[PDB]
């Protein structure tokens, strides 16, 4: 078993995690390049595999606590960059990829928190430190 407190996204400025990090989710994708020739041993769909583009997307939720890493993401959004982002998996290790800052949003209610979602997507080739 692995603690959900262990997997951490973190910005550059040298890497530090953001403050409100209530729920985060790295999500990989591939578009499944269908190569269905007429011949196929039972009429099954055949796929190519390595031809497909592959992606990554980070969706971080949290409560707005002011930190320099939280101010950094605003500066990354206004001065639109694609810097290095890094996401630990507990016992796998970090990812250390270039991402962008696709859509952030700050929210607040009459009774609750200052909360924020932070949605990111892949911008380059990723890595894995094991």
């Amino acid at each position: 078993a692995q603690n959900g407190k262990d997997l951490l996204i973190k910005l550059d400025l040298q890497f530090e995690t953001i403050a409100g990090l209530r729920a985060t989710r790295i999500s990989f994708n591939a578009e499944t390049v269908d190569v269905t020739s007429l011949e196929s041993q039972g009429g099954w769909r055949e796929l190519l595999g390595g031809a497909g583009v592959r992606s990554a997307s980070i969706s971080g939720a949290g409560v707005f606590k002011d930190a320099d890493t939280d101010e950094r993401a605003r500066q990354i959004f206004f001065d639109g960059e694609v810097p290095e982002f890094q996401v630990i998996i507990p016992d796998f290790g970090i990812v250390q990829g270039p991402f962008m800052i696709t859509s952030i949003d700050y929210a607040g209610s009459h009774n609750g928190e200052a909360s924020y979602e932070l949605a990111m997507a892949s911008a380059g080739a990723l890595s894995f430190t094991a």
Binding site: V33, V35, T36, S37, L38, E39, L48, A51, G52, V53
Partner: protein
């Protein structure tokens, strides 16, 4: 004219082709009209083949057009649709097969081909029309 190979195995869904008849015609403006054909056969006229595999299959496919192809050679063609007759009418087909078992030697109806790259390994070409020259 060769006896070299069938083809790459892959053919996409949409490989169209059916017999083409001279059908010289007069079209009298009165009404009914007569007609005759000088073939006594039918060019099968297959079109719209598509190669879709990895790029390892592409270099044996682009030179399929080039090496044994040129323009003017056989490359016996496989039909997904020694004399075969057609007996579903009281007339007859009785159409010959110079090659064995539906292998219909052809040639491509193209001065050039056009292979595309759709991803790191995807090789596509949209059409290779043939006409089965005897």
């Amino acid at each position: 004219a060769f006896h070299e190979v069938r083809f790459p195995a892959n053919l996409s869904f949409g490989s169209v082709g059916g017999p083409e008849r001279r059908t010289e015609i007069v079209t009298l403006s009165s009404g009914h009209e007569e007609r005759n054909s000088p073939w006594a056969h039918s060019r099968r006229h297959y079109d719209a083949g598509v190669g879709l595999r990895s790029l390892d299959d592409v270099e044996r496919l682009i030179a399929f057009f080039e090496a044994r192809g040129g323009q003017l050679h056989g490359f016996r063609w496989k039909d997904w649709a020694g004399i075969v007759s057609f007996n579903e009418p009281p007339p007859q087909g009785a159409r010959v097969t110079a090659g064995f078992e539906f292998d219909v030697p052809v040639r491509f109806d193209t001065d050039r081909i056009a292979v595309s790259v759709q991803s790191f390994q995807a090789g596509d070409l949209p059409q290779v029309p043939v006409v089965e020259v005897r």
